[PDB]
Amino acid sequence: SMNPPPPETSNPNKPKRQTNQLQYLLRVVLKTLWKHQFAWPFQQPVDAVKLNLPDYYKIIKTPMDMGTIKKRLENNYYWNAQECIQDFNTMFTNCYIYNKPGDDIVLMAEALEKLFLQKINELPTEE
Ligand SMILES: CCc1c(C(=O)N(C)Cc2cccc(C(N)=O)c2)[nH]c(C)c1C(C)=O
Ligand code: NA
């Protein structure tokens, strides 16, 4: 069994921009979600080999996780906040697509998503 390569986190050809919204996503949104008691299943790419989920990457073709998001934020991978917000949304949706409603992993995802959306409501205006 094999995992795919992880999502891209370095590309010197991709133009980059530091923005107050992106700083907010790292400083406030990611940091807050990362420390949450249910963050641990989302802090790295799903290891389908270790977890014995050989169909995972048959079902999930755009994998995403907070470890990848943290790296993208910390090493300034993004141009805008919407790119990052999309990554969070993809992580949550993948979980809801792959797992059954009311699986523990889904309850965890929903808790994080609720917190995520609350923080996104305070996304600062672009300076
Ligand atoms: C339920 C499996 C799962 C987890 C999960 O439980 N994880 C990823 C922690 C873990 C366990 C076992 C091993 C490891 C390691 N990385 O070594 C990590 N997270 C997600 C998004 C899912 C699914 C299928 O949606
Ligand atoms: Na499902």
Side-chain angles (χ1 to χ4, degrees):
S1 310
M2 302 171 59
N3 293 305
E8 174 173 284
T9 57
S10 171
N11 187 340
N13 283 312
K14 182 173 193 293
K16 315 299 200 306
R17 201 171 54 151
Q18 297 157 328
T19 73
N20 68 299
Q21 292 187 338
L22 284 163
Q23 290 163 350
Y24 172 87
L25 288 166
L26 174 52
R27 271 48 227 220
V28 175
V29 181
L30 187 280
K31 305 270 171 170
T32 298
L33 265 65
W34 193 267
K35 60 200 264 303
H36 191 276
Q37 67 170 310
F38 299 152
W40 65 273
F42 304 94
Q43 285 177 333
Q44 59 291 304
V46 172
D47 185 334
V49 171
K50 204 93 65 50
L51 284 158
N52 193 35
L53 298 179
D55 73 332
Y56 183 83
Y57 289 117
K58 252 306 228 196
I59 298 305
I60 299 302
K61 299 309 213 192
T62 303
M64 192 47 57
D65 66 277
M66 298 202 291
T68 297
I69 293 163
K70 181 167 200 266
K71 281 177 189 198
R72 293 187 164 182
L73 288 166
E74 289 182 347
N75 206 14
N76 300 94
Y77 179 76
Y78 297 115
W79 186 262
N80 67 43
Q82 306 101 92
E83 284 175 283
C84 180
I85 290 165
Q86 183 53 246
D87 283 343
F88 279 102
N89 283 138
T90 296
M91 176 179 84
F92 295 131
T93 291
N94 288 345
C95 187
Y96 306 149
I97 289 174
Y98 183 74
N99 299 284
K100 291 183 172 78
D103 276 1
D104 296 327
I105 192 63
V106 173
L107 293 174
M108 283 177 262
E110 287 173 340
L112 289 185
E113 184 181 16
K114 178 165 188 170
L115 194 57
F116 171 73
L117 291 175
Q118 274 162 8
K119 297 293 165 181
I120 291 311
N121 281 354
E122 306 274 334
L123 186 67
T125 342
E126 287 185 294
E127 283 168 20

